[PDB]
């Protein structure tokens, strides 16, 4: 239901230096819903609820497992990394829980106004 | 040469708010090579060369066309958005030029030390 390899990637350059991701850090604001997600310090959403600590990924550390509870809004977020570190759960208990398992999260896009309306998570599936 | 839909995405939540990307802004430092790329204000690379202006994507604006010249390093970067805005060319003239055409760039990962060694660009191909 989309052409094969229409979501893809390509590497340019050589083998030197240390790995980094454009997805460098995450924090959220939350109550019973998600108010905001903050990606690399950039705010996405409202100023309600409570600010989490910032989770900063190490070089070669990435989200390997993620649980989102959602409906018309993001209700809860938690994740785990390949190096065993956990973030959350942050948020409340309403909505359907869905889990990404044994992945490498590449990107988090989404939409937000005063609250966190939706996330669109791009990931490799192992 | 990887399973089908092993690089994928999934949407959570509803239809409200304004779109955002985790890939929010880009600037580079450059001379004849790429010294650094700066993604959402996060520095990746060295402190040599000259700092470009920061390119900030509008809601629903994304890189649709990208030219990278590279070898063992990133030598040149330029891009265009779906809304017609251009960034670069920044860098020098050594290496092989490769173009991504009619895409939507999702993520820029890579590796860097004192210079920008490699980029790994994740994108939809239209």
From Swiss-Prot, chains A, B:
Domain annotation Jacalin-type lectin: ranges: 6-125
Superkingdom of origin organism: Eukaryota
UniProt keyword list: Lectin, Mannose-binding
Molecular function, one GO term: identical protein binding
Pfam families: Jacalin
Keyword Secreted: no
Function description: Mixed specificity lectin with anti-HIV activity. Binds to HIV envelope glycoproteins, including exterior membrane glycoprotein gp120, and inhibits viral entry into cells. Binding to gp120 is dependent on gp120 being glycosylated, and is inhibited by mannose, glucose and N-acetylglucosamine.
Family: Belongs to the jacalin lectin family.
Name recorded for this polypeptide: Griffithsin
Origin organism lineage: Eukaryota, Rhodophyta, Florideophyceae, Rhodymeniophycidae, Ceramiales
